[PDB]
Amino acid sequence: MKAPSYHVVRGDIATATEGVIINAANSKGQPGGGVCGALYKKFPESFDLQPIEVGKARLVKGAAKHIIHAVGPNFNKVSEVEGDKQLAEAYESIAKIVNDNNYKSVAIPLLSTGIFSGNKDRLTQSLNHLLTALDTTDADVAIYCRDKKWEMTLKEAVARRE
């Protein structure tokens, strides 16, 4: 059995100390803010600049960072049923890369819970797809968030498991 471990981190994912970082990208590969996003400013070298399909992911092995760019659904644009399918897909595409490269630890935010949320709280929905996919890996998973209320909810959800 593959067995992940999970813990929650409130802060900036650029500062993460895991083996690889996940960029929750748009289909242009950009983080939030475009070129103004912290990850881009810090590691432009780990950003190739090519299109990524929705629900797909692409690893870039930057010297200063290894970054998995993964495209969740934009709920402003896609139906609830289609977006759920794509969200599960996006996390699955991340887990696959984690396995094929045998990453030991990974830093991951909650896909589609910001600009792609459609102004709804998707914490639980996004977390649940994250756990299902990362349960197929052996990685130690740092789950990243910005908001202090979200942090407490993430810890609860994480402790309820098993």
PDB file of C-alpha atoms in Angstrom:
ATOM      1  CA  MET A   1       0.000   0.000   0.000  1.00  0.00           C
ATOM      2  CA  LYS A   2       1.187   3.472  -0.774  1.00  0.00           C
ATOM      3  CA  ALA A   3       0.742   5.717   2.137  1.00  0.00           C
ATOM      4  CA  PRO A   4       0.881   9.435   2.099  1.00  0.00           C
ATOM      5  CA  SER A   5       1.180  11.768   4.968  1.00  0.00           C
ATOM      6  CA  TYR A   6      -0.587  15.138   5.168  1.00  0.00           C
ATOM      7  CA  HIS A   7      -0.119  18.366   7.149  1.00  0.00           C
ATOM      8  CA  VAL A   8      -1.350  21.891   6.665  1.00  0.00           C
ATOM      9  CA  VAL A   9       0.646  25.011   6.082  1.00  0.00           C
ATOM     10  CA  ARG A  10      -0.645  28.566   6.181  1.00  0.00           C
ATOM     11  CA  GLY A  11       1.591  30.834   4.084  1.00  0.00           C
ATOM     12  CA  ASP A  12       3.325  31.438   0.751  1.00  0.00           C
ATOM     13  CA  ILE A  13       3.900  28.299  -1.354  1.00  0.00           C
ATOM     14  CA  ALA A  14       7.067  29.892  -2.901  1.00  0.00           C
ATOM     15  CA  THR A  15       8.733  29.400   0.482  1.00  0.00           C
ATOM     16  CA  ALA A  16       7.798  25.707   0.622  1.00  0.00           C
ATOM     17  CA  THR A  17      10.589  23.215   1.458  1.00  0.00           C
ATOM     18  CA  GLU A  18       9.055  20.133  -0.165  1.00  0.00           C
ATOM     19  CA  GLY A  19      10.602  18.278  -3.169  1.00  0.00           C
ATOM     20  CA  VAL A  20       8.249  19.862  -5.703  1.00  0.00           C
ATOM     21  CA  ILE A  21       5.687  22.700  -5.688  1.00  0.00           C
ATOM     22  CA  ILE A  22       2.257  22.805  -7.429  1.00  0.00           C
ATOM     23  CA  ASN A  23       1.304  25.916  -9.393  1.00  0.00           C
ATOM     24  CA  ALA A  24      -2.484  26.190  -9.695  1.00  0.00           C
ATOM     25  CA  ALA A  25      -2.287  27.612 -13.184  1.00  0.00           C
ATOM     26  CA  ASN A  26      -4.636  28.857 -15.883  1.00  0.00           C
ATOM     27  CA  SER A  27      -4.398  27.232 -19.298  1.00  0.00           C
ATOM     28  CA  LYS A  28      -1.616  29.649 -20.220  1.00  0.00           C
ATOM     29  CA  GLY A  29       0.547  28.196 -17.449  1.00  0.00           C
ATOM     30  CA  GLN A  30       0.377  31.409 -15.422  1.00  0.00           C
ATOM     31  CA  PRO A  31      -0.227  31.646 -11.692  1.00  0.00           C
ATOM     32  CA  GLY A  32      -2.611  34.214 -10.226  1.00  0.00           C
ATOM     33  CA  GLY A  33      -1.508  37.712 -11.111  1.00  0.00           C
ATOM     34  CA  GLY A  34       0.195  36.523 -14.220  1.00  0.00           C
ATOM     35  CA  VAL A  35       3.777  37.575 -14.291  1.00  0.00           C
ATOM     36  CA  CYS A  36       3.104  39.500 -11.149  1.00  0.00           C
ATOM     37  CA  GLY A  37       2.484  36.362  -9.066  1.00  0.00           C
ATOM     38  CA  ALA A  38       5.041  35.484  -6.469  1.00  0.00           C
ATOM     39  CA  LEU A  39       5.942  32.156  -7.932  1.00  0.00           C
ATOM     40  CA  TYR A  40       6.659  33.714 -11.300  1.00  0.00           C
ATOM     41  CA  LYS A  41       8.783  36.520  -9.900  1.00  0.00           C
ATOM     42  CA  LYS A  42      10.799  34.089  -7.762  1.00  0.00           C
ATOM     43  CA  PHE A  43      11.149  31.203 -10.270  1.00  0.00           C
ATOM     44  CA  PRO A  44      10.520  32.355 -13.853  1.00  0.00           C
ATOM     45  CA  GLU A  45      13.049  29.580 -14.696  1.00  0.00           C
ATOM     46  CA  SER A  46      10.564  26.878 -13.662  1.00  0.00           C
ATOM     47  CA  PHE A  47       7.849  28.259 -15.959  1.00  0.00           C
ATOM     48  CA  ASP A  48       7.802  27.026 -19.487  1.00  0.00           C
ATOM     49  CA  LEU A  49       5.275  29.109 -21.353  1.00  0.00           C
ATOM     50  CA  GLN A  50       3.206  26.635 -23.229  1.00  0.00           C
ATOM     51  CA  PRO A  51      -0.585  25.871 -23.107  1.00  0.00           C
ATOM     52  CA  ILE A  52      -1.859  23.226 -20.646  1.00  0.00           C
ATOM     53  CA  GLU A  53      -5.263  21.560 -21.154  1.00  0.00           C
ATOM     54  CA  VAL A  54      -7.857  21.769 -18.349  1.00  0.00           C
ATOM     55  CA  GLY A  55      -7.408  18.869 -15.883  1.00  0.00           C
ATOM     56  CA  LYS A  56      -3.895  18.225 -17.214  1.00  0.00           C
ATOM     57  CA  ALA A  57      -0.517  18.956 -15.497  1.00  0.00           C
ATOM     58  CA  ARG A  58       3.102  19.608 -16.587  1.00  0.00           C
ATOM     59  CA  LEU A  59       6.346  19.281 -14.584  1.00  0.00           C
ATOM     60  CA  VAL A  60       9.196  21.740 -15.075  1.00  0.00           C
ATOM     61  CA  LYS A  61      12.505  20.809 -13.390  1.00  0.00           C
ATOM     62  CA  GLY A  62      13.874  24.286 -12.606  1.00  0.00           C
ATOM     63  CA  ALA A  63      17.325  24.377 -10.939  1.00  0.00           C
ATOM     64  CA  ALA A  64      15.968  26.423  -8.055  1.00  0.00           C
ATOM     65  CA  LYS A  65      12.568  24.632  -7.942  1.00  0.00           C
ATOM     66  CA  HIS A  66      10.700  21.801  -9.464  1.00  0.00           C
ATOM     67  CA  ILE A  67       7.219  22.997 -10.369  1.00  0.00           C
ATOM     68  CA  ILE A  68       4.106  21.031 -11.392  1.00  0.00           C
ATOM     69  CA  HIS A  69       1.718  23.316 -13.250  1.00  0.00           C
ATOM     70  CA  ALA A  70      -1.818  22.004 -12.953  1.00  0.00           C
ATOM     71  CA  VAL A  71      -4.991  23.417 -14.459  1.00  0.00           C
ATOM     72  CA  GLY A  72      -8.147  23.053 -12.353  1.00  0.00           C
ATOM     73  CA  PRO A  73     -11.604  24.066 -13.658  1.00  0.00           C
ATOM     74  CA  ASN A  74     -12.803  27.708 -13.750  1.00  0.00           C
ATOM     75  CA  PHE A  75     -16.314  27.559 -12.230  1.00  0.00           C
ATOM     76  CA  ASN A  76     -17.183  30.969 -13.705  1.00  0.00           C
ATOM     77  CA  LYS A  77     -17.102  29.116 -17.030  1.00  0.00           C
ATOM     78  CA  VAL A  78     -17.915  25.406 -16.591  1.00  0.00           C
ATOM     79  CA  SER A  79     -20.955  23.637 -15.106  1.00  0.00           C
ATOM     80  CA  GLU A  80     -20.815  22.206 -11.515  1.00  0.00           C
ATOM     81  CA  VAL A  81     -20.849  18.613 -12.855  1.00  0.00           C
ATOM     82  CA  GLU A  82     -18.195  19.160 -15.570  1.00  0.00           C
ATOM     83  CA  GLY A  83     -15.918  21.180 -13.222  1.00  0.00           C
ATOM     84  CA  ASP A  84     -16.054  18.493 -10.562  1.00  0.00           C
ATOM     85  CA  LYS A  85     -14.920  15.973 -13.197  1.00  0.00           C
ATOM     86  CA  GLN A  86     -12.044  18.262 -14.286  1.00  0.00           C
ATOM     87  CA  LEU A  87     -11.015  18.999 -10.702  1.00  0.00           C
ATOM     88  CA  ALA A  88     -10.647  15.260  -9.966  1.00  0.00           C
ATOM     89  CA  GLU A  89      -8.738  15.012 -13.239  1.00  0.00           C
ATOM     90  CA  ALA A  90      -6.312  17.830 -12.278  1.00  0.00           C
ATOM     91  CA  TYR A  91      -5.408  16.237  -8.983  1.00  0.00           C
ATOM     92  CA  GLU A  92      -5.032  12.810 -10.655  1.00  0.00           C
ATOM     93  CA  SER A  93      -2.612  14.379 -13.161  1.00  0.00           C
ATOM     94  CA  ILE A  94      -0.524  15.724 -10.268  1.00  0.00           C
ATOM     95  CA  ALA A  95      -0.402  12.337  -8.446  1.00  0.00           C
ATOM     96  CA  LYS A  96       0.711  10.594 -11.639  1.00  0.00           C
ATOM     97  CA  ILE A  97       3.716  12.943 -11.999  1.00  0.00           C
ATOM     98  CA  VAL A  98       4.528  12.576  -8.260  1.00  0.00           C
ATOM     99  CA  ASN A  99       4.632   8.776  -8.779  1.00  0.00           C
ATOM    100  CA  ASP A 100       6.496   8.673 -12.113  1.00  0.00           C
ATOM    101  CA  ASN A 101       9.247  10.831 -10.597  1.00  0.00           C
ATOM    102  CA  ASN A 102       9.080   9.264  -7.126  1.00  0.00           C
ATOM    103  CA  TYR A 103       8.815  12.633  -5.311  1.00  0.00           C
ATOM    104  CA  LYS A 104       9.176  12.095  -1.560  1.00  0.00           C
ATOM    105  CA  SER A 105       7.441  15.337  -0.508  1.00  0.00           C
ATOM    106  CA  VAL A 106       5.143  17.782  -2.331  1.00  0.00           C
ATOM    107  CA  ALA A 107       3.632  21.242  -1.579  1.00  0.00           C
ATOM    108  CA  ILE A 108       0.065  21.667  -2.972  1.00  0.00           C
ATOM    109  CA  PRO A 109      -2.573  24.364  -2.820  1.00  0.00           C
ATOM    110  CA  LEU A 110      -6.348  23.803  -3.128  1.00  0.00           C
ATOM    111  CA  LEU A 111      -7.103  24.004  -6.881  1.00  0.00           C
ATOM    112  CA  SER A 112     -10.064  26.124  -8.021  1.00  0.00           C
ATOM    113  CA  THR A 113     -10.650  27.749  -4.595  1.00  0.00           C
ATOM    114  CA  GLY A 114      -9.562  31.277  -5.637  1.00  0.00           C
ATOM    115  CA  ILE A 115     -10.130  33.050  -9.008  1.00  0.00           C
ATOM    116  CA  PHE A 116     -11.525  29.782 -10.419  1.00  0.00           C
ATOM    117  CA  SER A 117     -14.041  29.223  -7.567  1.00  0.00           C
ATOM    118  CA  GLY A 118     -16.891  31.207  -9.108  1.00  0.00           C
ATOM    119  CA  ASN A 119     -17.127  33.063  -5.757  1.00  0.00           C
ATOM    120  CA  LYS A 120     -18.137  29.952  -3.826  1.00  0.00           C
ATOM    121  CA  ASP A 121     -16.345  28.239  -0.974  1.00  0.00           C
ATOM    122  CA  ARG A 122     -14.868  25.011  -2.438  1.00  0.00           C
ATOM    123  CA  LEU A 123     -12.567  24.028   0.398  1.00  0.00           C
ATOM    124  CA  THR A 124     -14.192  20.629   1.078  1.00  0.00           C
ATOM    125  CA  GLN A 125     -14.776  19.767  -2.587  1.00  0.00           C
ATOM    126  CA  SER A 126     -11.168  20.598  -3.553  1.00  0.00           C
ATOM    127  CA  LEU A 127      -9.584  18.912  -0.480  1.00  0.00           C
ATOM    128  CA  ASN A 128     -11.560  15.681  -1.120  1.00  0.00           C
ATOM    129  CA  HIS A 129     -10.269  15.343  -4.691  1.00  0.00           C
ATOM    130  CA  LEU A 130      -6.746  16.171  -3.314  1.00  0.00           C
ATOM    131  CA  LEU A 131      -6.866  13.334  -0.756  1.00  0.00           C
ATOM    132  CA  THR A 132      -8.320  10.805  -3.223  1.00  0.00           C
ATOM    133  CA  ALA A 133      -5.461  11.375  -5.712  1.00  0.00           C
ATOM    134  CA  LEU A 134      -2.578  11.801  -3.274  1.00  0.00           C
ATOM    135  CA  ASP A 135      -3.698   8.610  -1.475  1.00  0.00           C
ATOM    136  CA  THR A 136      -2.201   6.835  -4.524  1.00  0.00           C
ATOM    137  CA  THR A 137       1.301   8.180  -3.717  1.00  0.00           C
ATOM    138  CA  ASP A 138       3.947   7.636  -1.019  1.00  0.00           C
ATOM    139  CA  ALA A 139       4.548  11.408  -0.608  1.00  0.00           C
ATOM    140  CA  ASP A 140       4.591  13.645   2.473  1.00  0.00           C
ATOM    141  CA  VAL A 141       2.079  16.297   1.422  1.00  0.00           C
ATOM    142  CA  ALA A 142       2.127  19.900   2.666  1.00  0.00           C
ATOM    143  CA  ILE A 143      -1.357  21.348   1.925  1.00  0.00           C
ATOM    144  CA  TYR A 144      -1.057  25.154   1.470  1.00  0.00           C
ATOM    145  CA  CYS A 145      -3.601  27.917   2.244  1.00  0.00           C
ATOM    146  CA  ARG A 146      -3.664  31.723   2.657  1.00  0.00           C
ATOM    147  CA  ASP A 147      -6.666  32.211   4.959  1.00  0.00           C
ATOM    148  CA  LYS A 148      -6.618  31.581   8.744  1.00  0.00           C
ATOM    149  CA  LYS A 149     -10.202  30.221   8.888  1.00  0.00           C
ATOM    150  CA  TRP A 150      -9.375  27.843   6.047  1.00  0.00           C
ATOM    151  CA  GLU A 151      -6.333  26.586   7.976  1.00  0.00           C
ATOM    152  CA  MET A 152      -8.477  25.414  10.928  1.00  0.00           C
ATOM    153  CA  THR A 153     -10.986  23.700   8.602  1.00  0.00           C
ATOM    154  CA  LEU A 154      -8.136  22.027   6.703  1.00  0.00           C
ATOM    155  CA  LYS A 155      -6.575  20.664   9.951  1.00  0.00           C
ATOM    156  CA  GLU A 156      -9.983  19.297  11.071  1.00  0.00           C
ATOM    157  CA  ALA A 157     -10.641  17.590   7.782  1.00  0.00           C
ATOM    158  CA  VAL A 158      -7.075  16.174   7.823  1.00  0.00           C
ATOM    159  CA  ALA A 159      -7.423  14.858  11.399  1.00  0.00           C
ATOM    160  CA  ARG A 160     -10.818  13.185  10.708  1.00  0.00           C
ATOM    161  CA  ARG A 161      -9.106  10.827   8.150  1.00  0.00           C
ATOM    162  CA  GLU A 162      -8.545   7.068   8.807  1.00  0.00           C
TER     163      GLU A 162
END
